[PDB]
PDB file of C-alpha atoms in Angstrom:
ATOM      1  CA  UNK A   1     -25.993  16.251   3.706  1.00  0.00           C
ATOM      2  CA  UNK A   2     -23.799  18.436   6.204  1.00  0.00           C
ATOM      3  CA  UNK A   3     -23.099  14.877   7.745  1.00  0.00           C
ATOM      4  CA  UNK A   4     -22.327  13.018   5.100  1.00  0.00           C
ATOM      5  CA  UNK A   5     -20.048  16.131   3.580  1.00  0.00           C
ATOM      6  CA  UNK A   6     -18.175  16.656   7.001  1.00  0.00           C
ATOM      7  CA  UNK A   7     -17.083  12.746   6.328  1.00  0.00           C
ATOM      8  CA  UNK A   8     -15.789  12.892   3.518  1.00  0.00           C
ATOM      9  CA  UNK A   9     -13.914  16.247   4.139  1.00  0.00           C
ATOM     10  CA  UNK A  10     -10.050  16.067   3.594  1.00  0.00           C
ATOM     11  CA  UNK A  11     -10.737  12.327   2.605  1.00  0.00           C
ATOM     12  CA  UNK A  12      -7.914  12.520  -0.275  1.00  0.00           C
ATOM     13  CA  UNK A  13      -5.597  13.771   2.194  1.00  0.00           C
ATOM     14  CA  UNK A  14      -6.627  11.416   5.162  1.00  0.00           C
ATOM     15  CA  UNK A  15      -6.260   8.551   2.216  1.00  0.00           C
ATOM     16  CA  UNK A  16      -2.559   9.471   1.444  1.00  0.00           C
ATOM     17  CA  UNK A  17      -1.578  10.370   4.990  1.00  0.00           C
ATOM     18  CA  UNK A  18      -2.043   6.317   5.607  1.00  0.00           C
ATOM     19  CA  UNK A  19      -0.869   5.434   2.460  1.00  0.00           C
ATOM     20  CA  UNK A  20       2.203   6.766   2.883  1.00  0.00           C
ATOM     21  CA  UNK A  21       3.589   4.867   6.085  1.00  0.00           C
ATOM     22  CA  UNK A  22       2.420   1.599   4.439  1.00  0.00           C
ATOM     23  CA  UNK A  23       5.601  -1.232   3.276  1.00  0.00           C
ATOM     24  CA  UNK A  24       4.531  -1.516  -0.485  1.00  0.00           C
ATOM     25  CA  UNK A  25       6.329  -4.563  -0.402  1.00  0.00           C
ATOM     26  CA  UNK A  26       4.439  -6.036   2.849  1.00  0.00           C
ATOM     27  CA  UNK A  27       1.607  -6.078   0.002  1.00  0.00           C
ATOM     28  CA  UNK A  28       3.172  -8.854  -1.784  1.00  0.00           C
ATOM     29  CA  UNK A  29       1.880 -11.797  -0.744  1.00  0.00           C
ATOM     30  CA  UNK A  30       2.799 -15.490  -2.207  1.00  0.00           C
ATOM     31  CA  UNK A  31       0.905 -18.573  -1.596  1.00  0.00           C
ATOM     32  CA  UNK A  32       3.286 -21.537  -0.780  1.00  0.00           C
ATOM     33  CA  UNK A  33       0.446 -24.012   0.215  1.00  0.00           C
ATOM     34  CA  UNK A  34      -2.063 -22.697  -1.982  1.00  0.00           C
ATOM     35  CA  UNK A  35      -3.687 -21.755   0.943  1.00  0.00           C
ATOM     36  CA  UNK A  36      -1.965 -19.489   3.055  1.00  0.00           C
ATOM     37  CA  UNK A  37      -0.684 -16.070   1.584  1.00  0.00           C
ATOM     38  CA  UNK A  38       2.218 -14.644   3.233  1.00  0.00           C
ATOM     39  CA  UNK A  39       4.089 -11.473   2.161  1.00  0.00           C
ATOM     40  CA  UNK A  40       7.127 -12.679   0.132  1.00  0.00           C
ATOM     41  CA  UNK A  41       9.426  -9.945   2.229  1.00  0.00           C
ATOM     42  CA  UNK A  42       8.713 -12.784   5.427  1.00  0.00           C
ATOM     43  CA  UNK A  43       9.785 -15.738   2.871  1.00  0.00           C
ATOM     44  CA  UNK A  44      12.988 -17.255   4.439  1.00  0.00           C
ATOM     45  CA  UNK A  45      14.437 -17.664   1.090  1.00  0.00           C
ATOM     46  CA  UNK A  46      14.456 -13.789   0.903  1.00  0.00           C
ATOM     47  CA  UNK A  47      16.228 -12.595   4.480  1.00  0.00           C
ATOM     48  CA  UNK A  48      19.481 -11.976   2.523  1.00  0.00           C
ATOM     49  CA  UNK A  49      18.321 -10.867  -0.901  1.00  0.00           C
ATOM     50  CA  UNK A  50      18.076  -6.789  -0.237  1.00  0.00           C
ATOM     51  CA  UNK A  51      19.717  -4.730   2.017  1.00  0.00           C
ATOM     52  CA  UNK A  52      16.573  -3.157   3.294  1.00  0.00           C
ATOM     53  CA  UNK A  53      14.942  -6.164   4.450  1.00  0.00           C
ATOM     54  CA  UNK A  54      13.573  -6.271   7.856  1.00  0.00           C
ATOM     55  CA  UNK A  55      15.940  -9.186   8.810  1.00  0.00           C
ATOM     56  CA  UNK A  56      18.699  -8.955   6.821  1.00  0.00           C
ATOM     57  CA  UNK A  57      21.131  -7.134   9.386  1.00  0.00           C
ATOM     58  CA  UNK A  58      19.984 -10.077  11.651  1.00  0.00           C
ATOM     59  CA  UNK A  59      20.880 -13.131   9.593  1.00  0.00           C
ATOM     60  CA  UNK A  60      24.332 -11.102   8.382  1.00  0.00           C
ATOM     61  CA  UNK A  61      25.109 -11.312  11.792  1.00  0.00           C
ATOM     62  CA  UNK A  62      24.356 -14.703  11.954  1.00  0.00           C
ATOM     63  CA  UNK A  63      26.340 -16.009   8.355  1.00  0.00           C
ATOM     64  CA  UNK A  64      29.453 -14.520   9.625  1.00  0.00           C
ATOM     65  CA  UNK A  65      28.560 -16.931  12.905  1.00  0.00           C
ATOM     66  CA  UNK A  66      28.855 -19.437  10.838  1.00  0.00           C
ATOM     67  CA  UNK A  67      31.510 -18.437   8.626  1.00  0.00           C
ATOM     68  CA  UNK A  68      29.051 -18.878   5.451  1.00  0.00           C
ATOM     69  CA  UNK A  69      29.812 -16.591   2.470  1.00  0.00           C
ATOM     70  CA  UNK A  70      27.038 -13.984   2.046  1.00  0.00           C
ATOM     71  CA  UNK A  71      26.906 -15.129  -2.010  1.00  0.00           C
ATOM     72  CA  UNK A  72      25.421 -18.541  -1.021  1.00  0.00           C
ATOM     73  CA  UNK A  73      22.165 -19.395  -1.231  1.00  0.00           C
ATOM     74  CA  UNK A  74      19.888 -19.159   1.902  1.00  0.00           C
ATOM     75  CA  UNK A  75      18.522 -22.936   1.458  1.00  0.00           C
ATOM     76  CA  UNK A  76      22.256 -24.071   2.373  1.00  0.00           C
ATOM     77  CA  UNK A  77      22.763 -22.348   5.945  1.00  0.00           C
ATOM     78  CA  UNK A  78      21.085 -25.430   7.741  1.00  0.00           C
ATOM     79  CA  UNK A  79      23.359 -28.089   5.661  1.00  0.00           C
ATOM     80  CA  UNK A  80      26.444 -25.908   5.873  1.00  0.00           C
ATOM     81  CA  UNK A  81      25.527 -25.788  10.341  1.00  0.00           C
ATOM     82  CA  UNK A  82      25.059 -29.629   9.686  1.00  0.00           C
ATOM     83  CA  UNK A  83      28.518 -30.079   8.210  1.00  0.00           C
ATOM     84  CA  UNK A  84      29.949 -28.387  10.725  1.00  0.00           C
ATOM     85  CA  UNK A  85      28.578 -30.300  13.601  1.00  0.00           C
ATOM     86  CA  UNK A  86      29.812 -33.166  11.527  1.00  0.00           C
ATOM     87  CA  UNK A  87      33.107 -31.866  12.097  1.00  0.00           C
ATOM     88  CA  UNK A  88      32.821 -31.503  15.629  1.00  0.00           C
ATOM     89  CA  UNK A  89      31.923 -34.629  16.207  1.00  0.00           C
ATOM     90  CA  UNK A  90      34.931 -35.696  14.366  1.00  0.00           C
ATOM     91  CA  UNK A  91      37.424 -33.276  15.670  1.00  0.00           C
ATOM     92  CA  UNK A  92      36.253 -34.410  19.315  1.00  0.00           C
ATOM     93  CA  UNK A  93      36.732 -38.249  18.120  1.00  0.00           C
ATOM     94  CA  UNK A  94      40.785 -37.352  16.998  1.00  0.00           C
ATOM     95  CA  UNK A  95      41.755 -35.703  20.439  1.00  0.00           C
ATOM     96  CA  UNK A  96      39.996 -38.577  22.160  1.00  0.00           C
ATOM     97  CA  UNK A  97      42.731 -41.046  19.783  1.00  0.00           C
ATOM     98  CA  UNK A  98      45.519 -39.192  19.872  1.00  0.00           C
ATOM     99  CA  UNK A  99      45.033 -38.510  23.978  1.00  0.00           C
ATOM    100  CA  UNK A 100      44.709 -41.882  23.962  1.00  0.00           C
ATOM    101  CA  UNK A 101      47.934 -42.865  21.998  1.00  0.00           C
ATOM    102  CA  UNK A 102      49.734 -40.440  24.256  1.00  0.00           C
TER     103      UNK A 102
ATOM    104  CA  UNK B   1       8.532   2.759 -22.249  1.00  0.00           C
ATOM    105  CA  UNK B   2      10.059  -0.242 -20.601  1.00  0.00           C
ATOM    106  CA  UNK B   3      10.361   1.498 -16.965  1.00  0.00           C
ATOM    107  CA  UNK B   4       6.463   2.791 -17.622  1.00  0.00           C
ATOM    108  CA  UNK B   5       5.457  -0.852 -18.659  1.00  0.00           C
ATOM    109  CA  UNK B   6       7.506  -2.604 -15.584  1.00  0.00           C
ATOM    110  CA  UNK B   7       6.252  -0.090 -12.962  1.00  0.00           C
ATOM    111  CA  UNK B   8       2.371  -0.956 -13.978  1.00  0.00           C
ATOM    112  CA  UNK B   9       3.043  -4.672 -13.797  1.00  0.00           C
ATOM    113  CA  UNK B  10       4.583  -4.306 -10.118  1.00  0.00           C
ATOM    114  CA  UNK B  11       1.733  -2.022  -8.963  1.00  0.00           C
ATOM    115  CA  UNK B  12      -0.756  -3.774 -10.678  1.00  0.00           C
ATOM    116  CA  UNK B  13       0.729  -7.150  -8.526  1.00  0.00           C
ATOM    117  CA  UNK B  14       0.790  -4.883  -5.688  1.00  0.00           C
ATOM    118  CA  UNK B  15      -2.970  -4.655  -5.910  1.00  0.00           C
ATOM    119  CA  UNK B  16      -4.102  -8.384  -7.172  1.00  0.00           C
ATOM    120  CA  UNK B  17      -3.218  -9.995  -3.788  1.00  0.00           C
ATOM    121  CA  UNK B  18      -3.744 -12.977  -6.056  1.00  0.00           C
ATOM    122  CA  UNK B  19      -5.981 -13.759  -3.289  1.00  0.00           C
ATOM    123  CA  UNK B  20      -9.323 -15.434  -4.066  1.00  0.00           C
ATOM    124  CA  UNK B  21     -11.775 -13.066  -6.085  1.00  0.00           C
ATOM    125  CA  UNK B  22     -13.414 -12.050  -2.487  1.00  0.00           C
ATOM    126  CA  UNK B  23     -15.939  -9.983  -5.027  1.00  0.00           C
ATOM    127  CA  UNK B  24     -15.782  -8.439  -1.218  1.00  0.00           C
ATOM    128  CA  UNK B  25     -11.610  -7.016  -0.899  1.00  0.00           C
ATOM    129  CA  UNK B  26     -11.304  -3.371  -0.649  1.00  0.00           C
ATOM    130  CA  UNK B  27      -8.547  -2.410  -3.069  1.00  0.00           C
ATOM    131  CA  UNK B  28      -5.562   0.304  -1.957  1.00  0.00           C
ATOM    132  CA  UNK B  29      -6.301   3.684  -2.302  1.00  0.00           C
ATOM    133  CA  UNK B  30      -9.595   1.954  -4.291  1.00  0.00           C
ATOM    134  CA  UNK B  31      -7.760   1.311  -7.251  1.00  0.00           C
ATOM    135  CA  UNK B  32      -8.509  -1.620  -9.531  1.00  0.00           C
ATOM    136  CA  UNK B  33      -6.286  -3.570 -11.821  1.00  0.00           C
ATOM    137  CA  UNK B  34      -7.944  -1.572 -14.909  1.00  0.00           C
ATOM    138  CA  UNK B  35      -6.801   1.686 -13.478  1.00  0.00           C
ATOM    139  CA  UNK B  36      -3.241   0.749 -13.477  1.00  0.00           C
ATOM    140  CA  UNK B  37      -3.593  -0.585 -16.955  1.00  0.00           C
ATOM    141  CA  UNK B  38      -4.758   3.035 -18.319  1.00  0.00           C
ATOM    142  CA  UNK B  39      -1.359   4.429 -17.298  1.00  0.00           C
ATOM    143  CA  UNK B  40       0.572   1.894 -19.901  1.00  0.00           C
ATOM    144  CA  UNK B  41       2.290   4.039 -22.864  1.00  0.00           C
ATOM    145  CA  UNK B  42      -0.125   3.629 -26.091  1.00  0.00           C
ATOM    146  CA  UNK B  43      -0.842  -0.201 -27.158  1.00  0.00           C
ATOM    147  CA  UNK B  44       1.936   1.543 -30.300  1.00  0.00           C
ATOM    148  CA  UNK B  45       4.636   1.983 -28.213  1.00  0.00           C
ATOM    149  CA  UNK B  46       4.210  -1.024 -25.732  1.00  0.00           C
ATOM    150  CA  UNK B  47       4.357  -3.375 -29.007  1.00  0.00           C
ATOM    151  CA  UNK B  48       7.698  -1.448 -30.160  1.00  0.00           C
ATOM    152  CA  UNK B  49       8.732  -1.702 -26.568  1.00  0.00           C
ATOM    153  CA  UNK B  50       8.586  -5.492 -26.434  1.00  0.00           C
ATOM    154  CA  UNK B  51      10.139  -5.704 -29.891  1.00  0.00           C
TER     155      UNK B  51
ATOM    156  CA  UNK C   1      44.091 -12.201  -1.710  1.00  0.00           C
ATOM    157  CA  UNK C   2      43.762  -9.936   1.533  1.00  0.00           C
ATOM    158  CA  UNK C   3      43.179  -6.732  -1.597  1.00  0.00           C
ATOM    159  CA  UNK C   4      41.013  -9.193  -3.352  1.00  0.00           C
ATOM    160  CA  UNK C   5      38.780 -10.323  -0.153  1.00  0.00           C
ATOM    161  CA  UNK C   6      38.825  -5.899   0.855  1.00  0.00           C
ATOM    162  CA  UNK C   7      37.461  -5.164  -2.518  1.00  0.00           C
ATOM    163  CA  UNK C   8      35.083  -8.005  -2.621  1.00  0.00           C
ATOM    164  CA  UNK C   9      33.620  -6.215   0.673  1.00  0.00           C
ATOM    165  CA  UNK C  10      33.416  -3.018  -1.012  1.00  0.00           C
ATOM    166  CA  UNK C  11      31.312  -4.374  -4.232  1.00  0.00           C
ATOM    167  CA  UNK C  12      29.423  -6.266  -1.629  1.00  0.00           C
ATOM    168  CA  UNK C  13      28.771  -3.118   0.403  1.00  0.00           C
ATOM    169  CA  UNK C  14      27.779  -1.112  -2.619  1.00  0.00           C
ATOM    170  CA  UNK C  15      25.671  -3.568  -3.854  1.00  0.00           C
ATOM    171  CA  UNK C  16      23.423  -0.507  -5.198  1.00  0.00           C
ATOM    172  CA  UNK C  17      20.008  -1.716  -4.058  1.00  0.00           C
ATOM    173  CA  UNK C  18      17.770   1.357  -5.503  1.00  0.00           C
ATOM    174  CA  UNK C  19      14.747  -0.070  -3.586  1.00  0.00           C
ATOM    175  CA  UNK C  20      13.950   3.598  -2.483  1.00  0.00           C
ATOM    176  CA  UNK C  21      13.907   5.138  -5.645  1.00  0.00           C
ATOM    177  CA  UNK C  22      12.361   2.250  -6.929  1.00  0.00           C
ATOM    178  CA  UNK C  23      10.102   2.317  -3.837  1.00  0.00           C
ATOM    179  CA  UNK C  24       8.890   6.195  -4.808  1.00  0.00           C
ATOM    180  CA  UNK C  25       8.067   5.705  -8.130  1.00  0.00           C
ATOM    181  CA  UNK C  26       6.027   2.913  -7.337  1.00  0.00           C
ATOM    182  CA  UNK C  27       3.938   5.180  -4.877  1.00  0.00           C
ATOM    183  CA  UNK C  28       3.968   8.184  -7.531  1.00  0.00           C
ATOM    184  CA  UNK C  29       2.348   5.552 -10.094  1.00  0.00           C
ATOM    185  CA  UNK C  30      -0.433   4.355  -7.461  1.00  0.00           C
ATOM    186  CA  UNK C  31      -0.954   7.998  -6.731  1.00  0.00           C
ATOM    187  CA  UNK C  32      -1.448   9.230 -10.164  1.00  0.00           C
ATOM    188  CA  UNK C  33      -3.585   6.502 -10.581  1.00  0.00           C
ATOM    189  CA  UNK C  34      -5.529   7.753  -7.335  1.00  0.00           C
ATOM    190  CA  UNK C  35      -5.388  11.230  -8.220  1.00  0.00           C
ATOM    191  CA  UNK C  36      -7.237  10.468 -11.468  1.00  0.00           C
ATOM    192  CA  UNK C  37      -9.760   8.333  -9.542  1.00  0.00           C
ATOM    193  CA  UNK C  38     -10.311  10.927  -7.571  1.00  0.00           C
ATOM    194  CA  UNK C  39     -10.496  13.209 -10.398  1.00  0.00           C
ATOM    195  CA  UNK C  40     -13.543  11.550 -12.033  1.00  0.00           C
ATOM    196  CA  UNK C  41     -15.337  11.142  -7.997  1.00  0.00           C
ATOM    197  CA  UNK C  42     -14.991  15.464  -7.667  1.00  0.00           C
ATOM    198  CA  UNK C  43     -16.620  15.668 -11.425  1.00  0.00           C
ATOM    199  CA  UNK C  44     -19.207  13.365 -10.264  1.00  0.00           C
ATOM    200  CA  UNK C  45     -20.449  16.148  -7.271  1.00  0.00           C
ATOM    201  CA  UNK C  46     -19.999  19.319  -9.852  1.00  0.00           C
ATOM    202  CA  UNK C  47     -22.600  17.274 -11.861  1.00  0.00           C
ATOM    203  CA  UNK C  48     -24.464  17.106  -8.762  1.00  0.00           C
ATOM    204  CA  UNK C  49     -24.059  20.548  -7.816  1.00  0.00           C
ATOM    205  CA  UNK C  50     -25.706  21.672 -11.223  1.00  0.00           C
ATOM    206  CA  UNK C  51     -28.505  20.441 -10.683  1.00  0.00           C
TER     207      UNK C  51
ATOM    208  CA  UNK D   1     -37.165  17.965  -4.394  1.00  0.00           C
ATOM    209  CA  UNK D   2     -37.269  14.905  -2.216  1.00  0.00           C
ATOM    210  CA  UNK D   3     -35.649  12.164  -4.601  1.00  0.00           C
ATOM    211  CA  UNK D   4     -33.076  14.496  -6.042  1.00  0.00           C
ATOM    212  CA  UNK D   5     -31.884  15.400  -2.230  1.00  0.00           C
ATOM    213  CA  UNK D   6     -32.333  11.632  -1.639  1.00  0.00           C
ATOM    214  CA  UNK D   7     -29.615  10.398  -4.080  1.00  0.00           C
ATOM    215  CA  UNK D   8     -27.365  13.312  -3.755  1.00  0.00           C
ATOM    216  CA  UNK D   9     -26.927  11.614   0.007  1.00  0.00           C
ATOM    217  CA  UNK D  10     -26.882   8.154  -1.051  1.00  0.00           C
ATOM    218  CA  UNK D  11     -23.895   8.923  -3.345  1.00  0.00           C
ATOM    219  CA  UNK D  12     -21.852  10.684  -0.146  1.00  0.00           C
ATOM    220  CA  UNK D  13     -22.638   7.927   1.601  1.00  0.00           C
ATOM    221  CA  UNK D  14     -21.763   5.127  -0.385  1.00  0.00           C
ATOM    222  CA  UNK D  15     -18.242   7.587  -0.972  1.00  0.00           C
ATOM    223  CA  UNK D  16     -18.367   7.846   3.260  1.00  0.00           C
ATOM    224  CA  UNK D  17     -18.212   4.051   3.705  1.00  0.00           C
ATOM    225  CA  UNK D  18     -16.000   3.487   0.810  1.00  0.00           C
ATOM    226  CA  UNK D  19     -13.668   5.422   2.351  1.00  0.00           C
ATOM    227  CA  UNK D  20     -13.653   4.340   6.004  1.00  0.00           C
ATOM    228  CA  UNK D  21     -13.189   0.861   4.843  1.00  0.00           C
ATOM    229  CA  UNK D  22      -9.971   2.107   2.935  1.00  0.00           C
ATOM    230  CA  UNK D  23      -8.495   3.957   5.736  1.00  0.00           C
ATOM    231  CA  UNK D  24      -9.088   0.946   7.793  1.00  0.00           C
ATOM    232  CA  UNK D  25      -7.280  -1.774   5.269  1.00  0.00           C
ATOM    233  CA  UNK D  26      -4.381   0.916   5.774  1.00  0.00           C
ATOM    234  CA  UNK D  27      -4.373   1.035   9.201  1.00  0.00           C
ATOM    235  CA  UNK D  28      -3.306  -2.560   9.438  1.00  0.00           C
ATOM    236  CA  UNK D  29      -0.101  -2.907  11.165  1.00  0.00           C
ATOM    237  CA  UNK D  30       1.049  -5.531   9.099  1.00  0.00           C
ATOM    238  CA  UNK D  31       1.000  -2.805   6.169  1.00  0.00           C
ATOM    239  CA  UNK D  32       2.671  -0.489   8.479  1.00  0.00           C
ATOM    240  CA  UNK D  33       6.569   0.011   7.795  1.00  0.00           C
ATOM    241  CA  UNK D  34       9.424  -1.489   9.114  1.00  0.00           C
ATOM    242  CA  UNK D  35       8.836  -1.994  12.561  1.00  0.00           C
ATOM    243  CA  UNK D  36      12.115  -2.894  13.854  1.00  0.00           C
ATOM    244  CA  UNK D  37      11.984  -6.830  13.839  1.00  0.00           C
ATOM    245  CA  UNK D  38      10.751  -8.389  16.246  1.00  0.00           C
ATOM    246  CA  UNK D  39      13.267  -9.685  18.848  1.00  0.00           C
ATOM    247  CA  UNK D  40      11.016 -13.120  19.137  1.00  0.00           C
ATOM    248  CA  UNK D  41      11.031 -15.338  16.393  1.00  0.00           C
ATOM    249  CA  UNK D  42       7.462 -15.527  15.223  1.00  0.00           C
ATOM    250  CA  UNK D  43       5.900 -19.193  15.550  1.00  0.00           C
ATOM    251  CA  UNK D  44       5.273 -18.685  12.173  1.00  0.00           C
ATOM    252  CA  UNK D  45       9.377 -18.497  11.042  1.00  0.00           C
ATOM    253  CA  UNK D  46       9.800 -22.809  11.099  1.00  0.00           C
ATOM    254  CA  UNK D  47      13.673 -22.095   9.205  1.00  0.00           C
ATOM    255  CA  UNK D  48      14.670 -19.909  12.416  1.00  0.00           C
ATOM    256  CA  UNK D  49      13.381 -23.003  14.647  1.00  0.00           C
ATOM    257  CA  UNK D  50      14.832 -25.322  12.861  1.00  0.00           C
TER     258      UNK D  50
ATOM    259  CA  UNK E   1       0.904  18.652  -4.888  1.00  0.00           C
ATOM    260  CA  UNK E   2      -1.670  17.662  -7.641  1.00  0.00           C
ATOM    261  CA  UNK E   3      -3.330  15.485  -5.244  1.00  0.00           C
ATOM    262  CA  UNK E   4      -3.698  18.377  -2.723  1.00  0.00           C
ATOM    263  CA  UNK E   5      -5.176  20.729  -5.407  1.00  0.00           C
ATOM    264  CA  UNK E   6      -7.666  18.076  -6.185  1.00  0.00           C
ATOM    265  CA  UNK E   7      -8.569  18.009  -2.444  1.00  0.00           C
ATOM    266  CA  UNK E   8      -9.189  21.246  -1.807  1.00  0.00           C
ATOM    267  CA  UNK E   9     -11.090  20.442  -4.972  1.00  0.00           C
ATOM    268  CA  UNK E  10     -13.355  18.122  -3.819  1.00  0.00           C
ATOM    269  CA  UNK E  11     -13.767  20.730  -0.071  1.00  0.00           C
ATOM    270  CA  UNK E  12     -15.319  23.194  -2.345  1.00  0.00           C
ATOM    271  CA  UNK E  13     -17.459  21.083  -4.463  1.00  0.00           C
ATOM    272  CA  UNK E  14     -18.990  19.467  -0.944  1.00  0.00           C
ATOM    273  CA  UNK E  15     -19.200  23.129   0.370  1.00  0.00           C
ATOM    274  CA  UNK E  16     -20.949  23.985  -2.847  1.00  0.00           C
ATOM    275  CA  UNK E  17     -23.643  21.191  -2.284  1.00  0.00           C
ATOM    276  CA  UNK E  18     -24.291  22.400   1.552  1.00  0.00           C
ATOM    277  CA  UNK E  19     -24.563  25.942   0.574  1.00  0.00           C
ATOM    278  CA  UNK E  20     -26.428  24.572  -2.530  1.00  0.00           C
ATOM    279  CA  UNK E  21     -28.850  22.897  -0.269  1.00  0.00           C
ATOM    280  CA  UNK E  22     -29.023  25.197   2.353  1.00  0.00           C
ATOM    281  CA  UNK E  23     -30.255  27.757  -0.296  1.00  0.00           C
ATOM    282  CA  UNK E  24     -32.608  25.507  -1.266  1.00  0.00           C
ATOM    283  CA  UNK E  25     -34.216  24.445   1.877  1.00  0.00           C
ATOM    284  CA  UNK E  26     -34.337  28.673   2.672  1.00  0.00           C
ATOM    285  CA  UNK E  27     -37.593  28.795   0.223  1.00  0.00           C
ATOM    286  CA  UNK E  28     -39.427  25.906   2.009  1.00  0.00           C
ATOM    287  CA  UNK E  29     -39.125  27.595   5.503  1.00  0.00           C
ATOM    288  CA  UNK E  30     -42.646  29.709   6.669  1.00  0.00           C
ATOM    289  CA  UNK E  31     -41.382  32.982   8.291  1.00  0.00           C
ATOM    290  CA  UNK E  32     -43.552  32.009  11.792  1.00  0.00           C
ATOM    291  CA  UNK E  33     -43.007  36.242  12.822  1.00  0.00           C
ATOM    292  CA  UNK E  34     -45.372  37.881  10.607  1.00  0.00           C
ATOM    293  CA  UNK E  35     -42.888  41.138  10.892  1.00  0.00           C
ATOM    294  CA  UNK E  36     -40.606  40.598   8.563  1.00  0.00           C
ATOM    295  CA  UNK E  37     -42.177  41.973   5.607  1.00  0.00           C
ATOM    296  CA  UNK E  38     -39.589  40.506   3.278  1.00  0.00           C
ATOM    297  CA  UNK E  39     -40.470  37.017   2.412  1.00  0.00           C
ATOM    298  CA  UNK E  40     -43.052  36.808  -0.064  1.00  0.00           C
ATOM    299  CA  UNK E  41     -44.638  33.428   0.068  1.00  0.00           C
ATOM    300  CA  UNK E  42     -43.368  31.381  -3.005  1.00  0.00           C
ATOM    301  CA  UNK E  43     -45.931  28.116  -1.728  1.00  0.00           C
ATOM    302  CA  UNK E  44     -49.583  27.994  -2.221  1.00  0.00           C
ATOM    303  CA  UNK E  45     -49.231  25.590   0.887  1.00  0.00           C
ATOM    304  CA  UNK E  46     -47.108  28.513   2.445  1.00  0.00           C
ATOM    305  CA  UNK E  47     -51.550  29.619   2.575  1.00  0.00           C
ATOM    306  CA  UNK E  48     -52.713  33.236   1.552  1.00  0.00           C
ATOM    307  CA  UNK E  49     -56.078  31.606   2.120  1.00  0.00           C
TER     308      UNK E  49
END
């Protein structure tokens, strides 16, 4: 009994003590396949929707890269990069003319 | 009212990792879904609430 | 437009995200609902104690 | 005497290992705050490979 | 702050039980040194035979 009482000793403060340096949010987990749940903070769709998120000052960094306005939509970075290697490609095709033509 | 009823639905979605019943997954802090539930305003209010 | 694109930064920038408020009252509700767990576990060992 | 003291433990101990199993769930470092992100992207992020 | 009050709580009612039991377990032990007067068998075990 003086075992079993020495373990559970403090055990609403040894409870809280972890609780509080959990993410609440890292609890939130969404299934995408059905199968696999991930926490919906690690969901690419949601690296720009709050401030706080773990890779939001990461992904700022790399919309301004890009010169994407922060109000779009995450699924259009990728499209948006394609464009602009589009453009490239087409910018590089004009000198080649007009150097030519010169 | 609202805030009370909003805050148990989050928490209580904080705890159902809608994971598969393992009748075996140790809940936070030990709390079940039913526990949240008895922290909603009376059934009264909830229903005026919603309203 | 360059006043227009300085404020637009500023809303941006105080896009009021009250996640940590938010964040506290969640953990206040999960701990009330602990506490009272915990509550009904100590009258549990009074009973005990009784006896 | 015997089967009094005998449940009295069984009820700490079923509290004991109720509560180790807790404080191990919350020790999981995926639970565990905001550990400045990683400077790797995970094998797991396919949108930051892409 | 609630939650702490309920854990020191919970200490005392767990110290309760050991003391509890400790008391307990105090009649069921047979003074081996026959000097000290003071504990009057409470076991017909204990002997008096």
């Amino acid at each position: 009994i003086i075992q079993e009482s020495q373990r559970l000793q403090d055990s609403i403060q040894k409870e809280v003590k972890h609780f509080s340096a959990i993410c609440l949010p890292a609890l939130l987990k969404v299934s995408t396949d059905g199968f696999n749940l991930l926490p919906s903070r690690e969901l690419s769709i949601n690296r720009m929707s709050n401030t706080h998120a773990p890779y939001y000052g990461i992904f700022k960094g790399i919309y301004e890269s890009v010169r994407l306005p922060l109000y779009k939509a995450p699924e259009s970075v990728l499209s948006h990069v394609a464009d602009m290697k589009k453009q490239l490609f087409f910018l590089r095709s004009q000198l080649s003319s007009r150097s030519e033509a010169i | 009212g609202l805030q009370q009823c909003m805050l148990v639905s989050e928490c209580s979605r904080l705890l159902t990792a809608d994971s598969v019943p393992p009748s075996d997954s140790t809940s936070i802090l030990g709390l079940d879904k039913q526990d949240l539930l008895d922290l909603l305003p009376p059934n009264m209010l909830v229903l005026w609430v919603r309203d | 437009q360059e006043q227009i694109q300085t404020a637009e930064r500023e809303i941006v920038g105080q896009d009021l995200n009250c996640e940590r408020a938010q964040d506290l009252c969640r953990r206040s509700l999960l701990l009330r609902a602990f506490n009272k767990k915990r509550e009904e576990e100590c009258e549990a060992l009074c009973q005990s104690n009784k006896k | 005497v015997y089967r009094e003291l005998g449940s009295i433990v069984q009820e700490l101990k079923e509290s004991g290992d109720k509560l180790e199993e807790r404080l191990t769930m919350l020790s999981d470092v995926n639970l565990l705050s905001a550990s400045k992100p990683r400077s790797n992207i995970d094998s797991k992020d396919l949108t930051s490979h892409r | 702050h609630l939650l702490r009050v309920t854990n020191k709580k919970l200490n005392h009612e767990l110290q309760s039980i050991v003391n509890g039991v400790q008391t307990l377990m105090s009649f069921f032990s047979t003074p081996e040194t026959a000097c000290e007067l003071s504990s009057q068998p409470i076991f017909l075990s204990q002997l008096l035979l």
